[PDB]
């Protein structure tokens, strides 16, 4: 576990953290596109 | 499932990263 | 024998001949012939456009002597090549781009001589610098008012480019004629030079405007930008709890914080950066 | 003197169609036509153009043809349809001007007293400003030329009119463009600028390597007129010019430092105005 | 002779190479300025005669040889310093 | 590699650990270079296992492309002499592998067990059994056509009805929905009659006998009416019957196109002949397609350029590419620009890198048709490929480019490359369903329709619910086709929106004030959603993970109903049955 699982379990941490991170970054960019698309359509 | 969890979160990185590059092209295009 | 989904090819020289003759004869209909080739039974291609001497009224316009007509086409054959008339055009200034009762009368004249004679409508008044209102129509019989007129084997001339406008179907569509689609064919040679005609030499890229007026312009803009900041302190602090659509109705008037404040910063940025950066290169590059 | 011409964008396109008429021969067939303009001012205008038949050989460049009869009748038509317009000169499509190109001017100076040419380029391999125009004078030299007759460079620009800006910029929609983008054109302009600088230096050393050794006439043209170009060459980093960059650039740095100091505060308003609207719409929903 | 580096020449080398005395070099150089083959200026607190403009003269083979060496040394520096602008900003200027 | 062999052959149990390891090394594998190095040893140990597994050693091999190694173990089964275990090695080979691969392996098979190569590589006993399944199972309705009968006018509707019953009666040979009348069928003219004799063969799909004998009226030299489209479009339907089966049907169509009329018969003949010789690289069909191409004619444009790619499927014969793209620069018509635009996309198929010089060469070009043609090519060079390299610039030019045609072809390339995981495509196209132009709003709808169509997707129907409300007519159209493809053979329990939409097509077809183009999707979806009496379905996919390449061709060619109506008559390639079938002897 400390030699054969911990190499993966500590590594999937930061792979979870960046997906956790940029989802906040994505939905910021999502709503900004919806502002301009509702502005151009109108 | 433990090797699959490590591979699938890698696949959820660049497939999610290309969406970040995508809105940069969208918001630049909508200003024109 | 049947129609199809037709397509009107153009030349890029034609559309500029269309509107400039139209704009210079604005308060009346100005007339001209249209000169091209019947490339197949499906599409049509105009390459040339020329006018003729005319005589008009406020409500009508007429051509004059046809000795101009054949002698014009004769001297276009020997320089270049021979070609073919395909139709004609005129203007409807400020109108709803629709075939008038005299405009339809010259079309049984033209459809009996050659089959797919195209009537083309231009308006240089409802056309803005963004886009042009060009239009082309094709007469249909009234004897086939019950029988079908197009076989409709595709979608390209049915729901595309618009549904027909309410001020044009009030006379026309789909009675007495049918509309037709227009695109833009482009040769590579003119396409490359239509791209680059708004650029300059390296003289314009390497100017340093003048440092007296540049400092004077910076002295100017910052000075009222102080006064914009005077008004900005009052309004942001003010904020009467008014459910801000009522903030958004008491601001139409003279009210303008936050709007000039973003504006003048953009002007002070792009002026100062380019004035510095061009002065940077004139020392690194030169000597 | 004329000191510039003003070319509308209806021509530069009514030339290229005529290059596209006879362009099936492919190899070489120069287009020559007739230019139409306005007897305006010292400054001059160009409005319209039309063509004329012309052929010429490869050797013995003295066999060439301008149909005068075609030039009389077709201009007689354009005089008939347009009384405002009259002739101002001519054009040819050749990328570099040829040796033949002076007798063509010497023909049609009997039509307009100052008959002006315009060279255009159907293929600007140079990405810079095409379609430059010349005029002929006499500059009789110390050498003993009976008539030193060579064309002079005249600056030029693309004209504009309210109707033609509609039709042209409608056709610009086939490609994308940033005319509205501030400082995005500007950074390209020094890139398009210094590309022009490097292009003129690679051309001038190709002339200078030939005239140095082996073969070229070494004549009292450019070789000292280009020596005067070296004479200017400012000595930029010297005694008192240092006090021109450290007394004036730091002036323009403060204005940028002012502009950032407000732009950060403006973007800080949008935080609190969003953070109030975020949680207070939340705490009343729950 | 000197390539415009310290071309503010003092009176002594004029008075030596023209072998005229010291108190006549000013009347000598004001003549050449009045005719117009030179466009310099005259100091007297140091008695240095600054040079700005020389008329262009005829030259020969080896003057062209150094002039290409001036031109190549100037041409390849412009191109290198223009790369440093584009290399600094690749996808920033579109 | 060798420690990976040590893991499977050590103190480690095998319930299924040698099964999902094949799945992980096939699904999430980076490249072909580390794939085949892993995959080729994993079935050598299966041959080294005491019981040799048979479906997986065939499954890997068609991924590995060994046209001799399956014949080697077939020889061992000839040596073992039992066709029971020599069966699933062979019909999984017929179901999954390519036509050229079976045309290449047959040399190693011929060099009972003598009858075996006929039984497994002709695949005839699957054809008439599929015909046996349709002649026995047929659960349709006459009343649905009678409900749509009441739109008698001079509009599309005659073509719209005959395209409906042709789709819902594929391969069942049942002419009672058409033989109820003659005059309403023979009302519309001059291209519907080209489609009316076209729809006759789709009903007789996959059947040798009733092709010449029923169309004996419709041979062009027997009746000779004033209509040549009625008699010239039969050869179109002959190719529809014998798709992926080449016999006299090649040469019966070959010798008639030597001497014929103008391109009113040569549309039906060339499209049929390229269909029967699809992916076969025959020189004899390439010869008369040369002289059909160089007619300098508009009406031969769909004739040559489509079938010129069909016979060269996945071939990348670079001189033929150079001949095609070198031809489509100087011609002055548009169908000759259009038919070659799909054909040069179809000449390259599943290459992952081997088109990228050409893809950049087409996208940079000034031609909007040819840039659009590069978008279909990168869609076909990455079939099912989850490569994030291709999605950079395929989807960049979906943003920036100015023609509407290329933008619709850009976003419809997404389901063609990402159907392997249908979970992700509703997450990326849902933002594109609200775009400012209707063209991207259209191609958003077909992208969900081509990806999740095999599944009853809960998320996609949630996205396509407000899409049928838009004031543009054709985006209301393509919402209905995508709503048809998403829920075929699904009854009320996979998703409750089935009968919520059955009434919705009848809601919009019985109205008078609707558009023609708006209700054209509804009449089309009636033939889709009840296809073959709920017996056939779409399948771009096998259980082996390998894609079904005629259905991939069939659904891509189906997208071009905008530019030719009976071009999307090529849809019978997508229809596949879902029926378990038992068998104990040869017969």
């Amino acid at each position: 576990g400390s030699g054969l699982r911990q190499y993966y379990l500590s590594k999937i941490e930061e792979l979870q953290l960046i997906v956790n991170d940029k989802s906040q970054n994505l939905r910021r960019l999502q709503a900004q596109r919806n502002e301009l698309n509702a502005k151009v359509r109108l | 499932d433990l090797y699959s969890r490590y591979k699938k979160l890698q696949q959820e990185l660049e497939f999610l990263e290309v969406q970040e590059e995508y809105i940069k092209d969208e918001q630049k295009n909508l200003k024109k | 024998a049947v129609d199809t989904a037709e397509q009107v090819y153009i030349s890029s020289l034609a559309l500029l001949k269309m509107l400039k003759h139209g704009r210079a004869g604005v308060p009346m209909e100005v007339m001209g012939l249209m000169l091209g080739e019947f490339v197949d039974d499906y599409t049509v291609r105009v390459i040339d456009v020329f006018a003729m001497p005319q005589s008009g009224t406020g409500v009508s316009v007429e051509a004059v002597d046809p000795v101009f007509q054949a002698k014009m086409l004769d001297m276009l054959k020997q320089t270049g090549r021979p070609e073919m008339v395909v139709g004609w055009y005129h203007s409807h200034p400020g109108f709803g781009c629709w075939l008038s009762g005299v405009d339809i009368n010259t079309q049984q004249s033209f459809e009996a001589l050659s089959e797919r004679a195209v009537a083309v409508v231009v308006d240089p008044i409802q056309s803005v610098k963004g886009k042009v209102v060009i239009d082309a129509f094709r007469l249909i019989n009234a004897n086939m008012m019950v029988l079908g007129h197009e076989p409709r084997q595709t979608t390209s001339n049915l729901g595309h480019l618009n549904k027909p406008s309410i001020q044009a179907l009030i006379h026309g569509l789909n009675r007495h004629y049918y509309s037709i689609t227009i695109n833009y064919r482009k040769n590579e040679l003119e396409q490359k030079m239509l791209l680059n005609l708004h650029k300059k030499s390296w003289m314009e890229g390497l100017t340093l405007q003048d440092y007296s007026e540049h400092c004077k312009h910076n002295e100017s803009v910052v000075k009222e930008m102080l006064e914009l900041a005077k008004n900005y302190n009052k309004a942001v602090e003010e904020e009467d709890k008014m459910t801000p659509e009522q903030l958004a109705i008491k601001n139409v008037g003279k009210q303008d914080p936050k709007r000039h404040l973003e504006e003048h910063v953009d002007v002070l940025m792009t002026s100062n950066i380019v004035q510095c950066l061009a002065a940077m290169l004139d020392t690194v590059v030169f000597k | 003197a004329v000191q510039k011409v003003v070319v509308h964008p209806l021509v530069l396109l009514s030339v290229v169609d005529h290059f596209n008429r006879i362009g099936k021969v492919g190899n070489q067939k120069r287009v020559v036509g007739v230019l139409l303009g306005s007897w305006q001012k010292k400054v001059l205008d160009v409005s319209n153009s039309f063509a004329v038949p012309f052929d010429e050989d490869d050797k013995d460049d003295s066999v060439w043809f301008l149909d005068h009869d075609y030039l009389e009748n077709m201009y007689g038509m354009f005089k008939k349809v347009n009384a405002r317009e009259r002739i101002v000169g001519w054009y040819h499509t050749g990328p570099k001007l040829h040796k033949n190109d002076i007798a063509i001017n010497e023909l049609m100076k009997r039509y307009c007293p100052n008959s002006v040419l315009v060279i255009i380029d159907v293929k600007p391999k140079d990405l810079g400003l095409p379609t430059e125009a010349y005029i002929s004078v006499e500059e009789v030299h110390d050498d003993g030329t009976p008539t030193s007759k060579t064309f002079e460079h005249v600056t030029s620009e693309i004209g504009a009119e309210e109707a033609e800006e509609v039709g042209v910029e409608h056709l610009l929609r086939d490609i994308k463009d940033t005319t509205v983008g501030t400082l995005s054109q500007r950074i390209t302009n020094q890139v398009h600028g210094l590309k022009g600088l490097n292009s003129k230096l690679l051309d001038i050393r190709s002339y200078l390597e030939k005239v140095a050794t082996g073969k070229l006439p070494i004549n009292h043209q450019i070789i000292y007129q280009l020596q005067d170009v070296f004479n200017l060459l400012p000595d930029v980093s010297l005694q008192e010019f240092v006090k021109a960059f450290y007394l004036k650039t730091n002036d323009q740095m403060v204005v940028v430092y002012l502009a950032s100091l407000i732009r950060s505060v403006v973007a800080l308003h949008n935080l609190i105005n969003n953070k109030i609207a975020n949680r207070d719409a939340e705490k009343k929903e729950g | 002779t000197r390539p415009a580096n310290h071309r503010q020449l003092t009176f002594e080398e004029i008075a030596k190479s023209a072998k005229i005395t010291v108190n006549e070099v000013e009347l000598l150089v004001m003549k050449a300025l009045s005719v117009g083959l030179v466009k310099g200026s005259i100091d007297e607190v140091d008695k240095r005669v600054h040079m700005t403009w020389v008329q262009p003269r005829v030259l020969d083979l080896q003057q062209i040889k150094g002039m290409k060496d001036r031109l190549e040394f100037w041409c390849t520096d412009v191109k290198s310093m223009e790369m440093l602008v584009e290399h600094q900003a690749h996808d920033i200027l579109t | 590699l060798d420690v990976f062999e040590k893991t499977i052959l050590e103190s480690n149990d095998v319930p299924g650990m040698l099964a999902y390891s094949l799945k992980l090394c096939m699904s999430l594998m980076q490249n072909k270079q580390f794939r085949n190095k892993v995959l080729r040893v994993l079935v050598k140990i299966y041959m080294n296992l005491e019981k040799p597994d048979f479906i997986n050693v065939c499954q890997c091999l068609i991924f590995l492309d060994d046209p001799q190694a399956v014949s080697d173990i077939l020889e061992k089964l000839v040596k073992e002499d039992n066709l029971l275990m020599a069966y699933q090695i062979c019909f999984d080979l017929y179901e999954s592998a390519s036509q050229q691969f079976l045309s290449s392996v047959i040399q190693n098979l011929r060099t009972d067990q003598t009858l075996k190569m006929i039984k497994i590589l002709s695949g005839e006993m699957a054809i008439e059994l599929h015909l046996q399944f349709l002649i026995r199972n047929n659960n349709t309705d006459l009343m649905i056509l009678k409900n749509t009968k009441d739109a008698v006018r001079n509009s599309v509707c005659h073509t719209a009805t005959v395209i409906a019953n042709s789709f819902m009666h594929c391969g069942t040979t049942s002419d009672q929905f058409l033989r109820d009348n003659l005059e309403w069928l023979a009302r519309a003219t001059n291209w519907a009659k080209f489609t009316a004799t076209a729809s006759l063969g789709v009903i007789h799909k996959g059947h040798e006998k009733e092709a010449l004998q029923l169309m004996a009226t419709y041979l062009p030299k027997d009746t000779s009416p004033g209509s040549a489209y009625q008699e010239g479009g039969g050869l179109y339907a002959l190719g529809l019957i014998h798709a992926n089966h080449g016999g006299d049907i090649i040469d019966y169509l070959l010798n008639q196109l030597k001497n014929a009329s103008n391109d009113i018969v040569r549309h039906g003949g060339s499209l049929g002949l390229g269909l029967a010789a699809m992916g076969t690289a025959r020189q004899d069909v390439y010869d008369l397609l040369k002289t059909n191409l160089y007619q300098d004619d508009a009406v031969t444009g769909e004739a040559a350029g489509l079938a010129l790619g069909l016979v060269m499927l996945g071939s990348k014969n670079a001189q033929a590419i150079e001949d095609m793209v070198g031809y489509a620069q100087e011609t002055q018509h548009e169908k000759i620009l259009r038919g070659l635009a799909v054909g040069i996309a179809l000449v390259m198929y599943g290459r992952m890198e081997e088109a990228d010089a050409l893809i950049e060469s087409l996208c940079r070009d000034k031609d909007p048709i040819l840039r659009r043609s590069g978008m279909y090519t990168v869609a076909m060079a990455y079939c099912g490929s989850g490569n994030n390299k291709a999605i950079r610039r395929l989807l960049h030019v979906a943003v920036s480019d100015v023609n509407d045609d290329v933008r619709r072809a850009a976003v419809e390339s997404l389901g063609f490359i990402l159907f392997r995981t249908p979970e992700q495509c509703p997450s990326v196209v849902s933002l594109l369903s609200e775009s400012y132009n209707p063209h991207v709003r259209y191609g958003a709808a077909m992208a969900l329709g081509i990806c999740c169509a095999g599944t009853g997707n809960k998320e996609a129907i949630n996205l396509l619910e407000p899409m049928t409300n838009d004031p543009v007519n054709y985006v209301r159209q393509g919402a209905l086709i995508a709503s048809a493809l998403i829920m075929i053979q699904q009854t009320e329990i996979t998703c409750p929106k089935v009968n919520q939409f059955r009434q919705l097509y009848s809601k919009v077809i019985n109205d008078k004030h609707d558009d023609v183009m708006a209700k054209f999707g509804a009449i089309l979806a009636q033939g889709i959603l009840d296809a073959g009496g709920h017996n056939v379905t779409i399948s771009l996919q096998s259980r082996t993970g390998h894609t079904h390449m005629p259905s991939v061709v069939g659904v891509l060619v189906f997208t071009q109903f905008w530019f030719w109506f009976p071009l999307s008559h090529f849809l019978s390639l997508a229809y596949t049955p879902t029926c378990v079938i038992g068998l104990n002897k040869d017969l």
Side-chain angles (χ1 to χ4, degrees), chain D residues 4 6 52 65 77 80 90 95-96 99 121 123 129 165 173 180 197 199 214 224 250 254 260 265 270 277-278 280:
Chain D
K4 66 180 181 293
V6 174
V52 63
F65 296 96
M77 294 179 183
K80 184 176 181 180
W90 62 280
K96 306 302 185 72
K99 188 177 179 181
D121 194 0
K123 297 181 290 294
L129 190 144
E165 288 176 354
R173 298 293 179 89
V180 296
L197 270 300
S199 179
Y224 64 84
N250 54 1
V254 174
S260 65
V265 174
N270 293 320
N278 193 2
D280 294 332

Side-chain angles (χ1 to χ4, degrees), chain A residues 1 3-4 6 8-9 11-13 15-16 19 25 27 29 33 36 40-42:
Chain A
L4 56 95
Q6 193 271 333
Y8 289 169
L9 267 70
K11 188 64 70 69
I12 58 99
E13 178 69 26
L15 270 298
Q16 184 65 42
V19 178
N25 195 7
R27 290 188 296 273
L29 270 301
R33 186 261 183 189
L36 276 73
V40 171
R41 183 186 295 272
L42 264 295

Side-chain angles (χ1 to χ4, degrees), chain E residues 12-51:
Chain E
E12 183 180 0
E13 193 266 325
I14 289 95
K16 182 184 287 185
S17 296
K19 63 184 290 184
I20 197 65
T21 187
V22 175
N23 291 318
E24 293 294 327
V25 300
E26 293 85 3
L27 282 76
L28 193 146
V29 298
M30 288 185 288
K31 181 69 176 178
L33 290 166
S34 66
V35 174
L37 56 93
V38 66
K39 287 195 288 284
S41 68
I42 290 95
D43 194 2
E44 297 188 2
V45 69
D46 293 333
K47 290 181 262 74
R48 293 182 183 272
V49 182
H50 181 73
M51 290 290 107

Side-chain angles (χ1 to χ4, degrees), chain F residues 125-138 171 206:
Chain F
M125 63 182 66
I127 301 300
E128 288 95 14
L129 180 63
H130 173 70
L131 180 67
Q132 186 62 257
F133 180 71
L134 293 174
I135 196 66
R136 295 292 183 268
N137 206 167
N138 193 0

Side-chain angles (χ1 to χ4, degrees), chain C residues 2 45 146 152-155, chain F residues 154 190 332 562-563 565:
Chain C
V2 75
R45 178 177 292 171
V146 177
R152 191 171 298 117
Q153 72 273 18
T154 187
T155 64
Chain F
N154 290 320
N190 202 358
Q332 64 184 357
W562 274 347
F563 294 150
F565 279 169

Side-chain angles (χ1 to χ4, degrees), chain F residues 319-333:
Chain F
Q319 290 84 17
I321 286 96
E322 183 180 1
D323 288 331
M324 287 185 286
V325 71
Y327 183 75
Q329 291 179 357
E330 70 274 14
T331 182
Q332 64 184 357
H333 300 285

